[PDB]
Amino acid sequence: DPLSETKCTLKSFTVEKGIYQTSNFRVQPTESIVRFPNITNLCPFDEVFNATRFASVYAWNRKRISNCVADYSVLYNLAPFFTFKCYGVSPTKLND
């Protein structure tokens, strides 16, 4: 009851005459929506990681990765992938 909420707010069973602000109204959502772009194609994350030969320290190669559906869950499930340290990002919430 709204009268019982005044007894919990002021912490007293005998509530005197007056006006009291107990709580605030808030309409909670009933549905849940998510929108992602219409792409489906996979991009060469596998080719950059599992290439045959690699570049040296100087003149490093940089692959432009854009317009794909990324999927990191196929990356860090590999057996020689020992360490995985991230910066400003948690390693588990990478797919979202």
């Binding site: 959502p29 549905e31 849940s32 929506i33 998510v34 929108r35 772009p37």
Partner: protein, 48 residues
């Protein structure tokens, strides 16, 4: 539209009611932020 829903639009999570705007956006823009980084407007990546 026209109901308060939990929206997750390209990583921006939150709660609010969405309605069709009358705003004249330029095509290079994709987001409209109000006073003090308030997410006032958004463009969906599907039908734009």
């Amino acid at each position: 539209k026209n109901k308060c829903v939990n929206f997750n639009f390209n990583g921006l999570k939150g709660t609010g009611v969405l309605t069709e705007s009358n705003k004249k956006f330029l095509p290079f823009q994709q987001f409209g932020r109000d006073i003090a980084d308030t997410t006032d407007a958004v463009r969906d990546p599907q039908t734009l």
